[PDB]
Symmetry: C2
Subunit: 53 residues, 2 copies
């Protein structure tokens, strides 16, 4: 029952946290560790769009 | 600076939702599409534990 926007929005609230965290985490150690989670979340967001209708 | 807990919690609020989404997604087509998120999305928590302090 009407449950998929609830998943996707929390899914993108992490991606948007990951943008702002990247501004603070500008050091190359963390900037190359949160980037792999960012690319994994962009993968989920692609599939979430493919599954939306 | 100490934002890592805030990211992990929103990362786990999707995961706690996803724990129940898997029951409504009992159909095996869906249960092999949200499953690849679940395996990636547990992986973030796995690295976040190594990042914690
Ligand atoms: Zn995700
Ligand atoms: Zn994640």
């Amino acid at each position: 029952m009407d449950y998929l926007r609830e998943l996707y929005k929390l899914e993108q609230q992490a991606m948007k946290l990951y943008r702002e965290a990247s501004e603070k985490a500008r050091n190359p150690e963390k900037k190359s560790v949160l980037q792999k989670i960012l690319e994994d979340e962009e993968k989920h967001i692609e599939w979430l769009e493919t599954i939306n209708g």
